[PDB]
């Protein structure tokens, strides 16, 4: 009685475009074109697909199948699979928090640009502003200029001294105080996700119609726009020129694996939640297949969208697009790409749809990000919770604002990197490995093939079987070992992070991980019996 059976989605296309909305984000736009053109160019497509087929797709489809089959949250599903690994559901809840502290501040920057892009003369065109230094040298100014080590462009000056105000902080040590503009921007973001999540899957699923389709439109406008620019073939040459020798490096495969994993994002509980609210009779194999193939191809065309404008920018400057595309991160889109689109007709248009496109890219993904955690807590503490959804949703949203207050600082950008590199990647890889191993090895991949066989009507192929049993946990294990062995020294804006950052990072990387061995200790520590007896009753799910 009472609630009993769970709710169901409003249409097939909503959940298709919804999982597409989670899959597609900023990184699809600029991360993949950079990592592609840097690691052997077009040849990077060869391992990228392999790491997709053997790694990303199986985790994606396994996660999705479990989600639609068991209809449980990220915490409650472990109660009915492997209770000792229930802490996994908790770990994600912490991980997501760390992500929601920086991912939306980027959307706040794109939002600050968007509202600052309504003026007839764009701010980052002239140097006669209140934030530019004496180094600021700009165009529509005398030709022959010969750039100096200390000179700075109006776009770099605008991004550095205004929207970030990063010159007012010395690094991780001193980063305060808070830029209230980015606080209001990210507040508006938390509002626009508040009215798109608070109701549940119906609103996220309806806002997704806009948040997942518009990026293709803006990418299409900047695509046909960037294609008509003179000398844009340079960026395409640098973008797709095959350099097969780079394929001999054992690093490149690692980069491809990490890319496809962190662009499909399986085992994060978001796909579990998005899959939970669907029909048991409804097919999901085709769903997972098509959805991934969209995320990959969308990245492929996004490469052109970026490197066409970068090619035109390298033509107006002096070629070897790599030099104009050295820095990967927020500067490739907020400085180089913005300064590139500044010299184009009706620049207000392309600017508005560009930064609006950035916000539109982050919105759907963060919808899904929150959706997974919300589903997990509501399903884990029912009746004690579900009293209202706006209460718990409001709680997690304002929590994400207070979490971003460290990021809204002057040196917030610094923290963004520390959180983007150190915290998420190793832990997420770990929980994906433990999750995959627990579904494929503990629960038994045989019974999983029986669950899919009861789901779609047919048992999954021997390919999916061997991928889940061996190829996928080895796929995650690869990136785990390669990551731990060579953690990266990182620098941003002529500032090398202190030696101790990794320590801090490891804290932020493990402070979220402590819950699963301590929960195994809590489960095995709480029920008396013998060690062999209690772990045998704790590995087998509920019989009824």
């Amino acid at each position, epitope marked *: 009685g009472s609630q009993g059976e769970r709710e169901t989605w409003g249409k097939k296309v909503d959940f298709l475009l919804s999982v597409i909305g989670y899959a597609v984000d900023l990184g699809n736009v600029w991360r993949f074109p950079y990592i592609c053109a840097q690691n052997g160019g077009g040849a990077f497509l060869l391992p990228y697909t392999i790491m997709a087929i053997f790694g990303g797709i199986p985790l994606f489809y396994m996660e999705l199948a479990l989600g639609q089959y068991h209809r449980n949250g990220c915490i409650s599903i472990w109660r009915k699979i492997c209770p000792i690994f229930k802490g996994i559901g908790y770990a994600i809840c912490i991980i997501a928090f760390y992500i929601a502290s920086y991912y939306n501040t980027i959307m706040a920057w794109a939002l600050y640009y968007l509202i600052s892009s309504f003026t007839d003369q764009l701010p980052w065109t002239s140097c006669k502003n209140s934030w530019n230094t004496g180094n600021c040298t700009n165009y529509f100014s005398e030709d022959n200029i010969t750039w100096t080590l200390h000179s700075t462009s109006p776009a770099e000056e605008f991004y550095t001294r205004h929207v970030l105000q990063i010159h007012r902080s010395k690094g991780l040590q001193d980063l305060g105080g808070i830029s209230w503009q980015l606080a209001l921007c990210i507040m508006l973001i938390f509002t626009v996700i508040y009215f798109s999540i608070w109701k549940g899957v119906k609103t996220s699923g309806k806002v997704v119609w806009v948040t997942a389709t518009f990026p293709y439109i803006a990418l299409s406008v900047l695509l046909v726009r960037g294609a008509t620019l003179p000398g844009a073939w340079r960026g395409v040459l640098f973008y797709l020129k095959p350099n097969w020798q780079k394929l001999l490096e054992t690093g490149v495969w690692i980069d491809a694996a990490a890319q496809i994993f962190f662009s499909l994002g399986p085992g994060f509980g978001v796909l579990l939640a998005f899959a939970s609210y669907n029909k048991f009779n409804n097919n999901c194999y085709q769903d997972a297949l098509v959805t991934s193939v969209v995320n990959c191809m969308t990245s492929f065309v996004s490469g052109f969208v970026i490197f066409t404008v970068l090619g035109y920018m390298a033509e107006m400057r002096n070629e070897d697009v790599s*030099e104009v595309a050295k820095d990967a991160g927020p500067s490739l889109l907020f400085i180089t790409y913005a300064e590139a689109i500044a010299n184009m007709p009706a620049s207000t248009f392309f600017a508005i749809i560009f930064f609006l496109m950035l916000i539109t890219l982050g919105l759907d993904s963060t919808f899904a990000g929150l959706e997974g955690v919300i589903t997990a807590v509501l399903d884990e503490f029912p009746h004690v919770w579900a009293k209202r959804r706006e209460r718990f949703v409001l709680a997690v949203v304002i929590t994400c604002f207070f979490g971003s207050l460290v990021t809204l600082t002057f040196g917030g950008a610094y923290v963004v990197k520390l959180l983007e590199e150190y915290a998420t990647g190793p832990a997420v890889l770990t929980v994906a490995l433990i999750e995959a191993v627990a579904v494929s090895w503990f629960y038994g991949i045989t019974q999983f093939c029986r669950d899919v066989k009861e789901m779609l009507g047919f048992s999954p192929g021997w390919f999916w079987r061997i991928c889940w049993v061996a190829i996928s946990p080895l796929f995650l294990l690869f990136i785990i070992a390669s990551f731990l062995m060579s953690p990266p020294q990182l620098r941003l804006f002529q500032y090398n992070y202190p030696y101790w950052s990794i320590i801090l990072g490891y804290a932020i990387g493990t402070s979220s991980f402590i819950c699963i061995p301590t929960y195994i200790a809590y489960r095995l520590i709480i029920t008396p019996g013998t060690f062999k007896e209690r772990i045998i009753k704790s590995i087998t799910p509920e019989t009824p």
Partner: antibody
Amino acid sequence: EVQLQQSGPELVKPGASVKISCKASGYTFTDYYMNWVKQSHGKSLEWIGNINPNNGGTSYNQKFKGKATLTVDKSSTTAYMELRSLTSEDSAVYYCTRSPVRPYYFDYWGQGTTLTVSS
Amino acid sequence: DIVMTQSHKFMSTSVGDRVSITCKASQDVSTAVAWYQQKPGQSPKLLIYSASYRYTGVPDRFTGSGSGTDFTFTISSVQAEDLAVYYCQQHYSIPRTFGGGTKLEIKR
């Protein structure tokens, strides 16, 4: 005006090391990349690498990686290039030349440094 | 990398004649070629940058042209002191490479 006074000629036995200086003057030293070009007897110019005087930002050539080591000192506005594993091919004239960051031309050069690697 | 090829190692000209040295690059360069003048016994002296622009302190008798891959250095009034070895160098892709060097010998 702008002057790049290099060091004198050096006669060094093969297998040893040798360091060449480059006193820069006449401009804001921190405003320009400091480059090193190799010129073999009867050969063309050969770009060794550059260095950012602010933080010692060395950007070498794959052909000279581990062959040359560029350093810089702001307290005296002087850039140095050290060479190890000296052979008969290194017996060439070396120049230190100033360059902006873009466009990357070599506006001012040094007088050259005659290096002879022989026992 | 980039291979700058000066097919003609030597070129003969006279005082007052119109001389032009060619320069072939590996790939498309747009307008990123600099011409240097190394007089016998002196350091290479920068004359042209970015294909056509002249550098400061260079007489009007030195000009540059070309757009794409092949570029040309022109001297209208050759003087007795214009006797030198001319190099061409690209400035777009890392690393920066040079030409083989064209010695300009004067005929009298």
